């Protein structure tokens, strides 16, 4: 009932996707109290006054139940690394919200050379440093898939969240997962659902097999998540 939005090396796009549950946002903010989110709330303020300084700091509170962590971790920035360990220390459930936190995403391409922080060049998904409990791919994951995660987390629907808890153990995604796991292993039937999931239109169906345009893939993991020949839990088979 206490949720927190941690923002590391991201773009806030995942947070905006959460905001794009307009009607369900007012239904979620009554069932859960938000306790930390720099972009939304002034928590948690502590002032320290000496004879020569007045320090007004906003730190992550304790007793966070669910923590939506967005963005990767910069290994050359002390604050970025302090906040990923601090979020893990103070949250019972941490969720790798988006490809940046889950698998690196676009930040995998970072290599520095750019001032004004010429030393900043190493960016890793949060899973490489802390244990993560759930992972949500996509750049960004849809508002629909987000509502589903939050609903299942509050209702204890472990069966639904299993596919994301399993993802939390792998911190590497790519467009080539479709080839190495589905095409090369004689599983791809050619439905094309992966091409329809891609946010950069990097997948193109040729000869009934997905062709990845490698210079357009941002490694968001949406296509491998969708492939029903990789993961097809039996819960999907129940309809009405």
């Amino acid at each position: 009932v206490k949720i927190a939005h941690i923002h590391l090396c991201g773009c806030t796009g995942c947070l905006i996707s959460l905001a794009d549950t307009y009607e369900q946002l007012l239904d979620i903010l009554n069932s859960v109290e938000l306790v930390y989110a720099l972009t939304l709330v002034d928590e948690k303020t502590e002032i320290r006054e000496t004879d020569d300084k007045i320090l007004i700091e906003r730190e992550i509170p304790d007793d966070i139940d669910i923590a939506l962590v967005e963005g990767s971790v910069c290994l050359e920035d002390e604050h970025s690394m302090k906040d990923v360990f601090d979020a893990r220390r103070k949250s019972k459930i941490v969720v790798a919200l988006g490809a940046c936190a889950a698998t690196g995403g676009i930040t995998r391409f970072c290599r520095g050379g750019q001032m004004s922080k010429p030393v900043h060049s190493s960016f890793v998904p949060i899973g490489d440093l802390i244990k993560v409990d759930l992972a949500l791919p996509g750049c960004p994951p849809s508002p629909e898939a987000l509502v589903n995660l939050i609903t299942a987390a509050l209702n204890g629907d472990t069966e639904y969240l299993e596919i994301y808890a399993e993802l939390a153990k792998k911190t590497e995604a790519c467009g080539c997962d479709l080839l190495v796991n589905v095409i090369n292993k004689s599983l791809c039937m050619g439905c094309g659902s992966c091409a329809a999931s891609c946010p950069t239109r990097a997948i193109e169906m040729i000869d009934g097999k997905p062709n990845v345009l490698k210079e357009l893939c941002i490694k968001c993991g949406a296509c491998s998540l969708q492939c029903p020949r990789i993961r097809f839990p039996k819960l999907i088979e129940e309809i009405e």
Partner: protein
Amino acid sequence: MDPFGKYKTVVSARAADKTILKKCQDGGIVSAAYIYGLENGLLDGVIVADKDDKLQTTPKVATTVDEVLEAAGTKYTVCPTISVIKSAVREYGCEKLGVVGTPCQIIATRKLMKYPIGFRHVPDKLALIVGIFCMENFPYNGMKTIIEEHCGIKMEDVAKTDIGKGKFWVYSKWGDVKSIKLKETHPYEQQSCHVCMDYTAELADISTGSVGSPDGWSTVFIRTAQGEEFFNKMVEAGALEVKPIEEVKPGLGLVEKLSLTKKEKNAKEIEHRKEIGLPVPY
């Protein structure tokens, strides 16, 4: 722990050719070894790190002495000297190739030789592996802030940079000199150097640097037989002035000090990374 790795002998030396001394960083050992192989048929090509008018580095395969003299001097920024090693024995057609690199680059060359998966015809043609001492390195933009913003000198007006006396130095085309305390440069260093366990380029045929020897002289460790034969041909030909490191000051103790300070520090960083789950080489 071992300070300098294995070596045969340690001396203080400088080049005999006075021209070389006018352009080199310290004693001119790297340029003097390169010019001697080239002129006496022990090397037909040498790998160097060149600079442009703004101090930006470019690894290059040289084949003339003038190419060697232009590349003389230290550029305290990252330059991938090994990226041209296959080019050197391919289109350039070298067979007695000279290699220079910081310790990490010398390690990459030994790895290259032991497991030459993508290095057909390359290991057998490496005639002299020269390593230069190194404590830290910098991205170009990192050094640019240090020179232009902390020392107040434009890149295009830099004639020579030197690190020494807890100070970083910038010498200008127009006679000016500026030095800052070495602790103002730390935040700008390549962080991957914080796991480096090699200060004296312990895996080279010959290693050279400025610490331990006075200005204009280089402390040089001779390590392998290949480097021993080369060096001995040089002194016999009068290419070098040699004084035993036991007489010149400050001396070998300063090398040992720094070499162990680097190893003790970066050792902690390796264990720190292992602790929080980050990969290290093994």
